[PDB]
């Protein structure tokens, strides 16, 4: 025989289930009570439309919010389509059956109704807080009941005599003798403006300040329920001032939308300056939620957006997206990084659209280039459009910034490379020995003078199909003719043994000794190698507390020494080191030169004091303050 | 037995001029021989791309270790004492040709040989043999002799550069120092380090290796020493005669604070001889001395 | 008002790992990252061979002479070379290798080594010493001979 | 009248609401079904205590798992209790009922059984992954039946007649058509590793490769163990089982806590720092939370501190409230408590380990970053953190020394600690704010790291002695009568030379005075009490994501100290007394002032002047 069977349920521990092991926070008790109210006014409103007698019993539609300290209950008063009998003792009275989804079933096909709740175990977490429940309840084609219960297996239902409800619910919580939290001014407050701040109806809250004072608690609007194009930008503004407490308003907004099989809504404010403390990370970031159907969900948590683009504030809203059983997560969390595609998409359309305001965009430059650079660095997939979104000081420039994509349109026709320099700041770099060569034969050199800029160029190889070249890396190639080259070959020839007894005298602090080609007016300077950090990498990654100095010899670059054949010191030093190799005048210099080249090049000295002693040495001087076995040792053996 | 009418069946094509005199040489497996190379185009231009007798270089050229081209060995092997002859050869033999020639002249960017290998081609080859000697008789060169009997031969080059270095002469001295030194390095390689006889072939060295500093301090060239002799003060850090030469070519560079330094060490591991070594010292000192006088001369108010 | 001292970080990552090798550089424990980097599993390392038959042909010579030198002075510096991987291709690594002593005798060798990119390792082939001072001089020893049994690190055990 | 009803369920949607809305991971139900045989297995065990003869149907306990690509089924094999039909009936087929929590609640008080489940509602995750889900069951006091369902709202029980199974369960899934990546071994393995790694029976997988078989589980749980019964081999194999480490731990600590909140732990500490133990993109994966050894969230930043996180380890606990998904607690604030016990108990381990030396240097070379961090980030702990610190010293030669060796080799007449910041150990080492404070024979610490300039900061002072710097303005030394008199004549003899220097030197330093630091060399530089120093501005200056647009209100000013007894001091004042104006004494007084700030830590704006006045005196020393 094979016997068929149907699955069963228990009552007592599924309910102690639906209390203990459901919810995290006991706070959502709040938010749960209201979503309940809120789509009790959705059905009556409704409702209204076809019969407007269905209002006779009141024709405003609201929530209430009444603390009693002296009793210790909170009660939650809703004008809406009420409760039956029968609808009582099947809706509050059975897990997992909601009357809101038969509602929306019933519902004919296309109508302009979107109700929270599709569960039917909501209105038991307000046992969270609540030692006991009472739900009184009136309905259009029915008298007036009472619901009561503890959640201990049973509830009874009477009709109730006393002050008369026109129309809709009531619902009493008899808080627990610890949890009378709920009972203040504050905490509700603060409740529910974090769940029900968008909730479609005003939400009153009454206390005793005597006289009974009011407070609606949710004045702001959902404006991104509007088509775009009716917004104008004072609303916007408000919206935004009340979204973020700010004194001042956005600097550019966007307001798009997505259809097809996963469908949303999206509100992104650029702000006017920097928050104080953008990157600090110990802030639990909540820059942009997640909502659906007006009722929070969760904050961004760098899942919703790039950790770069932090500084953006905004709203995503949904209308079906697949819950959990507590309505602060999602099912099938690989939605988010489609969610993520699109939001990062729409945010770099928006900032190439504001750079056509050149005016607009240099405040938000000079607010968010460190963002931007950040990204750069760690955006791969983006990092074309993201560069296109740089400005930079130039040596042809002024004091204004110029954009790659006019470099590139300002270049010669021999060029085939942008050439930039990095330091420690634009004065530095300005005036370097690296520049003199580039500069005099009118090219154009890119000031970068802040450490992000390290980072960035890092991952910049190319802008346009132009390489990128510094200047301070040794293998610098500028455009060149016949008789540029052979006076350069001319002056190699000349110079080998001066640059050999050089690469002699400096044993191990440098690679290799050469003839520049970047030199106009100095002596000398000091290249670092292709690969390896330059000087000033190699400076900002010394200074970070965070790093391991055991990885510094793996990403260091060698020294290369490179002399100007056409200065009087080093037409001096090859005729004295022709006369006499071993001169002491000479190692003398050549040690000072090469220190002084350090200093000026980036570098820091390994022993300061040794260039400051020999500094406090020429001052003096200027000053004029002051047997038979010996050739049998060194002979053989 | 009939090598004549091996070369043709081979694919290469001979002719001889002269017919050289004496027998035919054994040519085993190892054996020098000497003699002038001239090479020419065939027919696709007919000029010369290398040549020696032109100017007087002679090619040598020892018969059979691996000498990756098998074409001159077999060429060279068909030729008696003093027999002049000239022939061409296919592309087969000389494809790889670009691999010989580009050093073995300059070694004493080419746009003629380079030639063949954009088009290759015969090539004609104008030998002419002077003389033939197996091994036994030549003085061997170094880098072909065998392990077991270069060990044997290490004595002799260090005998014959002291030798030279008594008379008066440094340069080959030195030379003779170099592929002695050279000598005994290689065969290190064939051992295990740490091993005993690791440490046996090292404590063979340093003697000579001593002998080329004191060779190159005298021939004035001092940055060369200061290597080799850290090389031997790391690892042994007991050598009085190391000491002293690193010493003596620091003061000889003006490097004052490391020549006193080292001065010391040798003066409390060998406090035999302190009139040297104080000696040493205070001729450091005057010398420093006279250019610091200079030096106060030189700018002697440079400010106002 | 003005921010105190922080630490904010830019946290920029890196693929340094470490290995264990025995005294005849046979792989026998490596980091996690080097796994990735070099195809392989925990026994393969072992039973592949004793580490110089990882080694590309062209470096033997330059890891030779650094093995000698590490045995030397305990430790060789900085050096780039070809790396074998189970698909048989080939990456450029920089490694620096250390002796440990247990008690006044060698025991095994940690290395620390950075994968790199065919260009960095081409750049650091270009600019490899082409000789060592003591060499045989040019004696046509590449022409003539050509063939040296290498040195005896190499000889297995 | 006053009606009373009992609260009813709606099946369906509580099915629909199990299968839809519960769990966020699909691969959680083998998590389950594992449980569900670890807890069989144990209630056999338990019985056959008693009465040996419940094992006639077999003796080993082991759980097995099948895929079948070809029917496209998983099927779990275990070994024990079985069930009944009532029970198929009743503990299957009811939603919420648990048979588990009904067996321990039958059982006396202090039983040797701690089983998972309690919820009744966790078989139900099978139906995640498979369209129909077939069970076999069979009990030692009954027949061999078979349990069928799809989730539709019933199920079957039929007696089965198939192949015999001795004792026990077997759960066959027939798996969707999208699901079926659970049919391969390399996801089985993770899924099993991650979640069912400890699980107190042989976990065993069929595979054709012939249906060669493999143990999953081979290392067991030592830390139910007692701490004393433990060989340090043993603790190292599990190390090394657990980090994947091909090395053995350096330190290990085993504790328990008993009261309200119970829980046992095992920490170790790694012999070398990974490469990437800062590197931002990495999960706080270092410490792992189980409930009845069955894995349930990573540390995530509220089990330990950030600078501890070098710290590889296990907390397992026996009654955390979990929630449905059981992937976290309800009431997460416990979190907080087992922070504290953790942090309490690594620095008592920090504590043990310093009386070793080799082991302790090893660990501080390893990881000294991390507790600078600790220092500068925690405050409860600061005091503690102290005396783990250790510091190189201008007497300490190559080793080095902790603060207490520093306090306790103090002289009578010291009242402070001096310490230097720079960039490496031969700067400060060779400084000139060092010179006389070596030369009367104190001791300075040497820090040199920025790390350290950062702990600094927060370490005001040590055993109630204050840490001085001795590149601040008003450097105190204990002196004599006959020293503060040479003082106060050297000032009023050198007031000229100030004023004049000062004069020179508009805005570039707000004070120009007479050192009692220098010995050797003619002048320093030195910054304000309130401000930051050198070494300070040189770390701040450095940081890519500071705002850095207002930080000239941060920096200290510089004051230009004077050496008295220096030639060049002397004849400057010499130079000056006799003609003020001349062009020496300006050139001489700018390129000394460029010099002690190339030596003093900072940078120039414009290093190209310095070089050019260098090139300049060169032109003129060449003669050209
Ligand atoms: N204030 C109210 N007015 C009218 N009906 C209500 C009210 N509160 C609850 N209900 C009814 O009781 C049921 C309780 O279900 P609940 O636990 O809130 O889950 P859901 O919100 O998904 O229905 C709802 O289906 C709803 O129809
Ligand atoms: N493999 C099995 N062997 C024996 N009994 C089982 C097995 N799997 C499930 N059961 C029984 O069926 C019930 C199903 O409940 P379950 O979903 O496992 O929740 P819980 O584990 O909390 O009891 C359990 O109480 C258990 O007694
Ligand atoms: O650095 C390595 N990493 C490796 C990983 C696998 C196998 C070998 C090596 C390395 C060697 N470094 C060397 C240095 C000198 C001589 C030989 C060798 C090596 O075989
Ligand atoms: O109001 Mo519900 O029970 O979260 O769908
Ligand atoms: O096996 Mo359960 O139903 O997750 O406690
Ligand atoms: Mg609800
Ligand atoms: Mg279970």
Redesign the pocket.
Known sequence: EVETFAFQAEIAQLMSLIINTFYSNKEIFLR??I??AS?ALDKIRYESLTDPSKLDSGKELKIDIIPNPQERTLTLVDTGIGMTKADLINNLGTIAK?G?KAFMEALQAGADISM??Q?????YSAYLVAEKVVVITKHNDDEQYAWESSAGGSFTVRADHGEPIGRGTKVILHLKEDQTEYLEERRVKEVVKKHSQFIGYPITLYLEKKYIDQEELNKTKPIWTRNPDDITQEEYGEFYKSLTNDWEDHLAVKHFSVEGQLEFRALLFIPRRAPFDLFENKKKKNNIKLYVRRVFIMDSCDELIPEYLNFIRGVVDSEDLPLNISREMLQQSKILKVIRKNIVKKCLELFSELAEDKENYKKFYEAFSKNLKLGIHEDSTNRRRLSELLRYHTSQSGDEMTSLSEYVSRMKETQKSIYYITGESKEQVANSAFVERVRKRGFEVVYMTEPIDEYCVQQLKEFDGKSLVSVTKEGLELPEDEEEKKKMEESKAKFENLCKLMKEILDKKVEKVTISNRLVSSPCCIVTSTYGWTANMERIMKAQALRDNSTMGYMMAKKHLEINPDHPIVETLRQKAEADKNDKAVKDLVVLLFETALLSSGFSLEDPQTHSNRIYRMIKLGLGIDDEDASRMEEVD | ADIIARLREDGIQKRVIQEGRGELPDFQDGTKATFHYRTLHSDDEGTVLDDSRARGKPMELIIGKKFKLPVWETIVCTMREGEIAQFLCDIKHVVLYPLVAKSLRNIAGHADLDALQQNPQPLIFHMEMLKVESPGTYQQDPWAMTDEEKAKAVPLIHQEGNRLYREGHVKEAAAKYYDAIACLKNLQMKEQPGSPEWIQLDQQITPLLLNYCQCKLVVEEYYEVLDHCSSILNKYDDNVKAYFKRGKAHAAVWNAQEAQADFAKVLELDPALAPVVSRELQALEARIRQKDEEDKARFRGIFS | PLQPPSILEIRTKNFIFRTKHKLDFTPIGCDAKGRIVLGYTEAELCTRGSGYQFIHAADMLYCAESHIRMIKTGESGMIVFRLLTKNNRWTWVQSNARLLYKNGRPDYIIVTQRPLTDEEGTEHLRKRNTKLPFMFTTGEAVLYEATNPFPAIMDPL
């Open positions: 749960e009570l979503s309940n789509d909601s809101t929270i709740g569960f039917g175990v909501g209105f």
